[PDB]
Design an enzyme around this catalytic site. Structure first.
Site, short mmCIF file in Angstrom:
data_model
loop_
_atom_site.label_atom_id
_atom_site.label_comp_id
_atom_site.label_asym_id
_atom_site.label_seq_id
_atom_site.Cartn_x
_atom_site.Cartn_y
_atom_site.Cartn_z
N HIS D 30 45.52 78.24 7.68
CA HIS D 30 44.78 77.14 7.37
C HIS D 30 43.24 77.14 7.52
CE1 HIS D 30 44.08 76.39 12.11
NE2 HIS D 30 42.99 75.77 11.37
N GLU D 54 50.91 81.12 9.87
CA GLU D 54 49.41 80.89 10.06
C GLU D 54 48.97 82.26 10.26
OE1 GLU D 54 47.68 76.92 11.39
OE2 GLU D 54 47.47 78.15 9.81
N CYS D 139 39.08 78.45 14.78
CA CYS D 139 40.29 78.99 14.28
C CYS D 139 39.84 80.38 13.39
CB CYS D 139 41.06 77.93 13.54
SG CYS D 139 42.16 76.72 14.70
#
Ligand SMILES: O=C(O)c1ccccc1OC(F)(F)F
Ligand SMILES: O=C(O)c1ccccc1OC(F)(F)F
EC number: 3.6.1.15
Lengths: 171, 172, 171, 172
Positions: D30, D54, D139
């Site tokens: 993402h 992911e 992230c």
């Protein structure tokens, strides 16, 4: 006068008396051949199942010596619960578990849904006690909040390491 | 904990004591009945007492417990060792309370000055009570831990804080 | 806008800005030869020492960018604090510690008085970070309570194992 | 954590990525900019992409980082392993957040469905915030742990709960 009093041997594991008429356990431990439990016919028992969490409500007081406790659908993330393990030896074994999130969680080859947690003993029990064994399923998760004990689910599974446990919860 | 360890735990005065061997019994000084002149058939005369604050060791001149093997007693345990406290409670119930051991400390616990190996219970958040924590009646209960092969004993229950969470093990 | 902002290199270790005029540290790290600190002459600085806990109050705002925080004489037994360690490397290292009782506590051959605690990393750091080193002394102990951060003392000592720490506290 | 590990952590899209070798870069799916056609001078043409939910791995056809040695990437870590998450924050500050790893899980974190290795932060009680916990900007940050001799990398930062306390590491 004790919480330990409420932890009752049952099927392949244990369960817990929330009140004189309400008993909670882990679905996989319940007997698959039965006409009565604790001397009341299944006729008279409401069964409410939600995955690995089962609640029984009796039509008569089975444990009228008890008062009704708070039951909640799991606890706040970071709550430190006690799993109230009874062993066939006579041993009582309250172990601290820091609760995490609701999850579906692949526990030695099995899909189990509930609230995850980690045992504070970290030693990672492998035969000193200090952790859970398959026979412990259905033991309750409790914690103290203001003046009241809260029960928030029952022991459904644990990883070989011993670090990770799953508490099955009310839907 | 194995039954042969539970077997060593004896009701004694206001709490407990523990048989290290057929001739050696250990306990917390403050549970010893102050006016006692005889123990297990032997008069004081025949018993070697060794006391260091809240730890008392008795050596008898005859085997009081010939059913037992001699065990290892150590002067506390290494920091970070997780022990079990072998507590007996009402109705033949056995309560091995998990405790993470820390440092030799001196504390004031509810007016009274105490010295030994500090630890923190691993049984719950607020261990204030008989269900998750210690009670005055548990004084003398042994602290024990399993090694690769062994079990070892490293002290006896002397004190706990009003909170519940901190305990003190008195040591040789 | 950050707690890390308040952790300032000082003497042989660190200290912490509670407000624009109040700085706390561990007594053993303070320089034994000094005429001024942070550009104010000692002339103008109130020093309040209590064993291994020292508070300095300046006569002028040194850090007027900061608001005043709650300082307390230790915390409730069982509180999980964060020790805010800064390293000379640029590393910031917040470690969870479960606080125990006030005690005098023989830490590698030394008598130290304060609130004991145990690091949740249990791994028992021996060069992975995950624990404290002598250079870390004076780092603050904080925790969140309602909407407010509380500081309740400064890092004074730790055992070789790494499991046990002592927080020096306000008398 | 050693500087040669901090050296591997690269600013990438809405977060971070990590150089496993001179030709291998890993990151959280993402954070990858959706319209990008070129990375580090190479067009998509010349790059091997491997994606599993992911976790995204890029293999380039030329050494983008010849200063680096190849490292061990594993498919997560053993349960109970304590990892460091290598987070960079405003002002050349390095935040290696301690995390105890548990089980491969599937969760709903704030509306969105996530899969990988769960862990719990060891930085404080309520790790809700930038001072003790993760932020969306982290992230892709790598999860790493030291063995007897080694450091190993075992995944990248994909998610955290509204509480702060639980994280998810996406895995090969
Ligand atoms: O040998 C006995 O008489 C005995 C009986 C029950 C329990 C403990 C005993 O051992 C001793 F404590 F020494 F008395
Ligand atoms: O080699 C460079 O140009 C470089 C410079 C600063 C930081 C990272 C770098 O490596 C790369 F990420 F590949 F660009």
């Amino acid at each position: 006068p004790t919480l330990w009093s409420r932890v009752t041997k049952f099927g392949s594991g244990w369960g817990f008396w929330v009140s004189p008429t309400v008993f909670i356990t882990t679905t996989h431990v319940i007997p698959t051949s039965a006409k009565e439990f604790f001397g009341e016919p299944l006729t008279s028992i409401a069964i409410h199942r939600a995955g690995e969490f089962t609640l029984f409500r009796f039509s008569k007081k089975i444990r009228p010596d008890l008062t009704g406790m708070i039951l909640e659908e799991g606890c706040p993330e970071g709550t430190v619960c006690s799993v109230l393990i009874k062993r066939d030896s006579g041993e009582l074994l309250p172990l601290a578990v820091r609760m995490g999130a609701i999850a579906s969680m692949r526990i030695q080859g099995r899909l189990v849904h509930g609230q995850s947690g980690m045992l504070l003993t970290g030693a990672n029990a492998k035969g000193m006690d200090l952790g859970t064994i398959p026979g412990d399923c259905g033991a309750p998760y409790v914690y103290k909040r203001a003046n009241d004990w809260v029960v928030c689910g029952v022991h459904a599974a644990a990883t070989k390491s011993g670090n990770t446990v799953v508490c099955a919860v009310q839907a």
